[PDB]
Symmetry: D2
Subunit: 330 residues, 4 copies
């Protein structure tokens, strides 16, 4: 209808040099919906395809998302699959999978989530051969490494959300103690997105002023206790939140969107995303988070970060464990 209101221009039949930026979110539960909402409000994509096995709920969600378009800049939001609507998408965001129950480790979701990815990744390889894959499903590091092995895509284009979320939690907790903007706190969490994560106290600072002036050993006992209490709240954040509301979604939706921005907008910005360890600290054949330059080609550079002897030993231990967990699943 409306062909007498708008007259089509036959000159616009051939496509110009500009190609719309397409994104696809596979798995639309609590995490996938938070990602979709944030990515629409922040206008990341020109077209966004949503893929889920729960058809009815998905159809309802797409209706709700599309009704709010007049309040924000537009995005062609639709329900679809990689094989048709999601073909040649620039970024594939995979959140699909089982979430952890109360007191359940992320590591115990591995067998079930590899089974889910085997069904999904085959179509990503055939219909999106040039895409960046952004993995959110837990255990995030091992799911990123398995995606790399299954797809055979270049390691630069296989990125896990990793410790971007853990770093944001560390900064928020420290910023609450100082009553400042968390964007002014520069503190990192590296390694596994889980129990073996490593706080980089050696470089933690606000406005260039370090929180640990010399070494952790030279810190007073009362100060060591208050800083450890802050880190323990970061490692227990998922357990504490899941015990209260049943899951986590808002902060991961913003962390995932923040990574999509560095890629889409070719920003060359440093983020602690998960990716193949290919030499540093003697770590190999594994994925974990360390500061890296992120842009339209994925991981383009890695910060050659100087760590303390204790921080490096902890990172090495995190990697050996992650490799053993993947080896046991065969």
């Amino acid at each position: 209808m409306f062909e007498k209101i708008l007259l089509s221009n036959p000159s616009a039949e051939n496509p110009s040099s500009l190609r719309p930026r397409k994104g696809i979110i596979i798995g639309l539960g609590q995490v996938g919906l938070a990602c979709a909402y944030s990515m629409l409000i922040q206008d990341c994509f020109d077209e966004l395809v949503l893929q889920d096995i729960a058809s009815d709920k998905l159809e309802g969600e797409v209706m709700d998302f599309s009704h709010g378009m007049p309040f924000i800049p537009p995005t062609d939001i639709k329900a679809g699959t990689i094989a048709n609507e999601g073909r040649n998408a620039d970024i594939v965001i995979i959140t699909a999978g089982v979430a952890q129950k109360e007191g359940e480790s992320r590591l115990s979701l591995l067998e079930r989530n590899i089974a889910i990815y085997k069904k999904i990744l085959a179509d990503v390889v055939k219909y999106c051969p040039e895409a960046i894959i952004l993995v959110v499903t837990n255990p995030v590091d091992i799911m990123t490494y398995a995606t790399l092995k299954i797809t055979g895509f270049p390691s630069s284009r296989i990125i896990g959300s990793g410790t971007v979320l853990d770093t944001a939690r560390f900064r928020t907790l420290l910023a609450k103690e100082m009553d400042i903007d968390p964007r002014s706190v520069h503190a990192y969490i590296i390694g596994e997105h889980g129990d073996s994560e490593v706080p980089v106290w050696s470089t933690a600072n606000v406005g260039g002023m370090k929180l640990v002036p010399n070494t952790w050993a030279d810190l007073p006992e009362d100060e060591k206790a208050t800083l450890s209490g802050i880190f323990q709240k970061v490692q227990n954040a998922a357990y504490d939140i899941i015990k209260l509301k049943g899951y986590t979604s808002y902060a991961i939706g913003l962390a995932t969107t923040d990574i999509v921005k560095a890629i889409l907008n070719s920003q060359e910005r440093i983020l602690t995303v998960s990716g193949l360890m290919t030499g540093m600290y003697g770590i190999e054949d594994v994925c974990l988070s360390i500061p890296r330059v992120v842009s339209e080609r994925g991981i383009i550079k890695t910060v050659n970060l100087t760590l303390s002897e204790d921080e490096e030993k902890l990172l090495q231990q995190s990697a050996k464990m992650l490799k053993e967990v993947f080896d046991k699943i065969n």
Copy 2:
């Protein structure tokens, strides 16, 4: 951290700038979509969240606060009107029972008035100068009841009304033309419900009307295609609730869009719900018609010329709403 940041004794006295505080009462599906959108779009300097389900609320506040490094900051916290929410500039009330599958918004009235009588007592005492933005259904009658209970000026008692219905109408028409919904200028007025009125007499894109003369002078095949679009707007809540169980995302954006016109003193035209004091011979009821929204609430009303049929339908919607409130 007292040896890392040195406090300034000069900052003890408060400057002319007072932080913009907002409070959301009712953190269910709708309230949590409002909170998420309002944080990403940086509406408030401080935002208080109030709910009777303490544990779940504490978990939600933890989750919201962990994403702050990715956006500009807002002091997000759990609290009550009596303490943390004192003198908030805008009170957004979404608390209450939502409609089940096939249920009418109108049949949720007695249940939500009981909830409102408990909430509104504290708002009158601790936020006497606040704008109240009502989202709880039936939105028009909840807005009218809030006006009677609080006794606040009618300009400061606003319902979300048909801002959402107007956005749905524009999206459906824009999908048919494959254009930006912000380029479609079509309104839905009256009750946010079954008796809503599409203003076909003024619907247009770029000044070009969709109904060139009158609805009667339109071909039968065109009348059927336009009616199909309006029917999809009135059945939107029923169609979405049947698929996912509730609606949250579009109302979260509509509510945020109203808070932007107020906080930023924009003087922008929106079809929000508010007290009718005479227009089209309609009074002692709340419903949606285009109005200028700003920091003092409803500042002006568009003296909209309607067709004889559109005016009769609006009058019928009002009589119906008045009868629903009178029965309770």
Copy 3:
């Protein structure tokens, strides 16, 4: 020294599906520098090339623009030419040329500016064959038509800024009388961006409520005088501003950026931009402004706008005189 700080990733040697959005502004005087500032603050492009014959001033401007990057999201801003840095740019924004003096007509700049365009467009055809050209130089309508003839590009990809600016002025003046947001005033100015522009009083409205309820003739004499005073301020805006500060730049910089947003973000949004007339109201072989759908392929659709008999006659007269002005120069 920084090669030991950041370690390059050999996997990122091959380019992904994502290609950075490149734009080039040719002519960086008052208008061009307002466009560059707005487009940087609003983060339109991934890379933006600036081209001008005044090399020294341009080098200084690029230094200034690049120093403010830490306060906004990044853009690779650089000085260059179409032949090297500007190769395969998605949008070419041309603001180069002579501006009108006090009391001077836009039409009298035609001959001089076509001479400037002939030199510039030769490289645009060779190095940017797939680009959208956005023309701002005066007389914007005849300059858009001449660009079409010189380049031979599809008419959908040759767009003039047209009456987007005039429409914004009309809306602001009417909104000041009502004390409302100009974005809530829906009033159009169509035709030539100049003295023969046409106010579409037949459709001017706020919230669906028309300002002229029936016809201009059925309006009271006092109302006819107040509405005419508002339109006369719109046609005299350039003269009034140029007489006070010497030129106009800020509003055209925002109008140009608003057009770039509809193209880059594939918005399909209605704007009164200048473009080739193909028989609407019997008008052909001329460029002028009428409401059109703008997107990544340029002008995709045209609003089949119903005009009053007087408004249509005025639009037809505007086109006959624009055609005669171009014919006299050839």
Copy 4:
């Protein structure tokens, strides 16, 4: 248009929400870029512009207001502190004489103080609760002068300082590394000018320090390339002015950034110029140092540990800044 929009009599009484008003005094190259940036980034609800060149200001206000439909609205107008600018929350002063090719910032002091004494008298009388943001060079000495003439709490008198120089420093370093300038965390502190100090001891990217131990340990080829980059930072204004006549765009974005931390109550760390009250044994002078900025001005000060050279360089800068103020 009284028959188009009907005014609401309830909106006559004002609410707890009051519009954010800012005034820019001195609308030349710098002030015009502050205004354009602030309008596009929707900082204030009302923005008044003040300049002695009335006809030119009238032209700029017509131009700025014509672009309003493209961005969120702001009440832009020409006026004076005594009428349109009364009770401004933030007063931004960029008025004064700029430097020529090769002219030192400090020599502009004697002339600019005279200009300021006329302006500040009305700021004290009609905006007694305002934050004053000083841009006029020599910025540091004009900030201390503003602090002395007005008598306002030290927290409310803020200078643009080395926020701009810090942004240039990060940009030049990020150019070498081919990364986002927001990922480089390096500071320039002290006087905005020749005696500025680059904090090499704390310069880093992603936690990784640019100077691993001390400057003296650096290989001679590495310390020459680093010195080269700092030489380009201190000579940036000279190099730009010789090429285009003045600087406007980068300061326009730096001033807008300081204003964003104030209006939105962000508590963000910026290297702004302010009163030294004992840090490094330095007082009765104004210089840049990392500070917490919010709606009350300077709220806190980073107790930054500096290298022995960095500290001695910073205090020498302060001793000579207080000598220039005494010669007046």
